[PDB]
Design a protein around this ligand. Sequence first.
Ligand SMILES: OC[C@H]1O[C@@H](O[C@H]2[C@H](O)[C@@H](O)[C@H](O)O[C@@H]2CO)[C@H](O)[C@@H](O)[C@@H]1O
Length: 321
Amino acid sequence: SVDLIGINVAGAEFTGGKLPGKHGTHYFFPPEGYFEYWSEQGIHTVRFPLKWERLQPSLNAELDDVYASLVDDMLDQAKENDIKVILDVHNYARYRKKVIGTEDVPVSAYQDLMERIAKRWQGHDALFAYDIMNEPYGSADKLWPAAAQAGIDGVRKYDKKRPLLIEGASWSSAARWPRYADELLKLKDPADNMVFSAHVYIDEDASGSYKKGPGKDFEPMIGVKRVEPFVNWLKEHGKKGHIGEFGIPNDDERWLDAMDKLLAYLNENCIPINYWAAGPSWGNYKLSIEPKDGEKRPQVALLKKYAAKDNCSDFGPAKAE
Ligand SMILES: OC[C@H]1O[C@@H](O[C@H]2[C@H](O)[C@@H](O)[C@H](O)O[C@@H]2CO)[C@H](O)[C@@H](O)[C@@H]1O
């Protein structure tokens, strides 16, 4: 089943400056009882960021025992708690700051990573899908479509069933999607289970930093307006979609109204969303929906209303008929 409502659970990718880094100091996996809270809230799909450099300290070599085992543990806990997990290689189309497709990081090395990820986890019941790369951007954009095919090829050697979530150029911007996405039309998935995943924030620069409030001229449909270019492209090209990140601060009711409008539009078009973000070690982060003393998380109540609505049969938008 494809859940329309889901959340990111971030932390395993934190403190990119420290490699390998230390669990519990630089990065954080869900502790005991973590998924039970979210399951009880009625959330059954999670997107989980992972750091490539921690999974694979050397290219074209075996996955790191300790970090990969933490992923094993997380998947086990998700399964215990009725949660389905999208593994996200949260790397901006780069390995140790070098773009996939450059001499340092050949596409074959990225294919190798994806082979190893699918080989290790394809047998895990909690695994739902693979988001093969978070937010290609900048000098990675031009080479990304070639890298994406290599990633698809890698997963499909070992997992011929699960959805592949394919992000786009320019931080997978939903708003700018059609400017660049035609380059993705050459991608092929022999299993026919490929889904494009765009990101949308509704601050002025769409970075999610929220440097300003809604403003005097706030438009409630801002979220919808920013995903329309993506969804319309999907319809035009007969493709399937997904929103892998969207988040808002908890300090202005207007953001919630925009979120509501967005959720309605995505629901209508059978496009699932992963809210950014929950996680075990966010502290005061403005977009966090993790429970924290003294903080209300109105975004959660809203997600819960939607979570009750029927899911679609598959990733939308529905084919024309
Ligand atoms: O969208 C999340 C992503 O935003 C990045 O900032 C971009 C922004 O997306 C884009 O619309 C604007 O034109 O450019 C900025 C960069 O200057 C941000 O850098 C990422 O960390 C973030 O994940």
